[PDB]
Design an enzyme around this catalytic site. Structure first.
Site, mmCIF file in Angstrom:
data_model
loop_
_atom_site.group_PDB
_atom_site.id
_atom_site.type_symbol
_atom_site.label_atom_id
_atom_site.label_comp_id
_atom_site.label_asym_id
_atom_site.label_seq_id
_atom_site.Cartn_x
_atom_site.Cartn_y
_atom_site.Cartn_z
ATOM 1 N N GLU A 147 0.807 -1.219 0.000
ATOM 2 C CA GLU A 147 0.000 0.000 0.000
ATOM 3 C C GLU A 147 0.838 1.267 0.000
ATOM 4 O O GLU A 147 0.575 2.186 -0.763
ATOM 5 C CB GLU A 147 -0.936 0.059 1.218
ATOM 6 C CG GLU A 147 -2.107 -0.920 1.189
ATOM 7 C CD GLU A 147 -3.142 -0.617 0.100
ATOM 8 O OE1 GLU A 147 -3.051 0.453 -0.555
ATOM 9 O OE2 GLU A 147 -4.041 -1.468 -0.106
ATOM 10 N N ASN A 166 -7.634 10.072 -5.606
ATOM 11 C CA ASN A 166 -8.367 9.286 -6.581
ATOM 12 C C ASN A 166 -9.273 10.237 -7.333
ATOM 13 O O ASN A 166 -10.404 10.514 -6.919
ATOM 14 C CB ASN A 166 -9.183 8.211 -5.876
ATOM 15 C CG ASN A 166 -8.304 7.208 -5.156
ATOM 16 O OD1 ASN A 166 -7.478 6.536 -5.775
ATOM 17 N ND2 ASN A 166 -8.435 7.141 -3.836
ATOM 18 N N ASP A 176 -13.209 9.400 -8.070
ATOM 19 C CA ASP A 176 -14.342 9.605 -7.172
ATOM 20 C C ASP A 176 -14.108 10.670 -6.114
ATOM 21 O O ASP A 176 -14.864 10.773 -5.159
ATOM 22 C CB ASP A 176 -14.781 8.288 -6.532
ATOM 23 C CG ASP A 176 -13.859 7.827 -5.429
ATOM 24 O OD1 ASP A 176 -12.659 8.175 -5.431
ATOM 25 O OD2 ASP A 176 -14.366 7.132 -4.538
ATOM 26 N N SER A 192 -11.828 10.977 -3.748
ATOM 27 C CA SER A 192 -11.449 10.517 -2.414
ATOM 28 C C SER A 192 -9.923 10.449 -2.367
ATOM 29 O O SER A 192 -9.256 10.526 -3.402
ATOM 30 C CB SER A 192 -12.050 9.127 -2.124
ATOM 31 O OG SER A 192 -11.489 8.125 -2.958
ATOM 32 N N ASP A 225 -6.523 8.319 -0.321
ATOM 33 C CA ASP A 225 -6.031 7.227 0.521
ATOM 34 C C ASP A 225 -4.951 7.814 1.446
ATOM 35 O O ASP A 225 -4.014 8.458 0.970
ATOM 36 C CB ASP A 225 -5.439 6.122 -0.366
ATOM 37 C CG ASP A 225 -6.440 5.589 -1.374
ATOM 38 O OD1 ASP A 225 -7.628 5.475 -1.028
ATOM 39 O OD2 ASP A 225 -6.041 5.287 -2.516
ATOM 40 N N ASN A 279 -9.000 4.772 2.735
ATOM 41 C CA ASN A 279 -9.796 5.718 1.954
ATOM 42 C C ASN A 279 -10.752 6.662 2.699
ATOM 43 O O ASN A 279 -11.476 6.257 3.620
ATOM 44 C CB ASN A 279 -10.530 4.958 0.855
ATOM 45 C CG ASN A 279 -11.170 5.878 -0.150
ATOM 46 O OD1 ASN A 279 -12.352 6.198 -0.049
ATOM 47 N ND2 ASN A 279 -10.376 6.342 -1.109
#
Length: 130
Positions: free
Chosen positions: A35, A46, A49, A51, A53, A60
């Site tokens: 990750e 992102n 959408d 959002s 991380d 998220n």
């Protein structure tokens, strides 16, 4: 902070992650590895959408932490996304445990499925004293 492998393994073990909801420490190590490369400051936007991380586990913003700028988002860990960018990973761990209390468990992270699921992950904890 960018953790060294064994340092992180012992840190996670001390925080009660070994076998949390049936998930071995090696699985959590494999997840943090893929990750963020064990980087607590890591962030990924992102554009698709709106959002982001956050942190070592790349949790998220649409569902787990609040950053105020994610449309139609919730805060299931009840934490500011800022808490997921600390050198101290206690909060990030508390949130990761929350994620896995849901039906999917460790499967919540698609990187785990792609790079850890059904794989020999012993190598992540070898020599760490865990």
């Amino acid at each position: 902070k960018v953790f060294e492998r064994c340092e992180l393994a012992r840190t996670l073990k001390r925080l009660g992650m070994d076998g949390y909801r049936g998930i071995s420490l090696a699985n959590w190590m494999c997840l943090a590895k893929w990750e963020s490369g064990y980087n607590t400051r890591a962030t990924n936007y992102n554009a698709g959408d709106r959002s982001t991380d956050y942190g070592i586990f790349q949790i998220n913003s649409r569902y787990w932490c609040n950053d105020g700028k994610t449309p139609g988002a919730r805060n299931a860990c009840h934490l500011s996304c800022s808490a997921l960018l600390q050198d101290n990973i206690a909060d990030a761990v508390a949130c990761a445990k929350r994620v896995v209390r849901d039906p999917q468990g460790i499967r919540a992270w698609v990187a785990w499925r792609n790079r850890c699921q059904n794989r020999d992950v012993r190598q992540y904890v070898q020599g760490c004293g865990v």
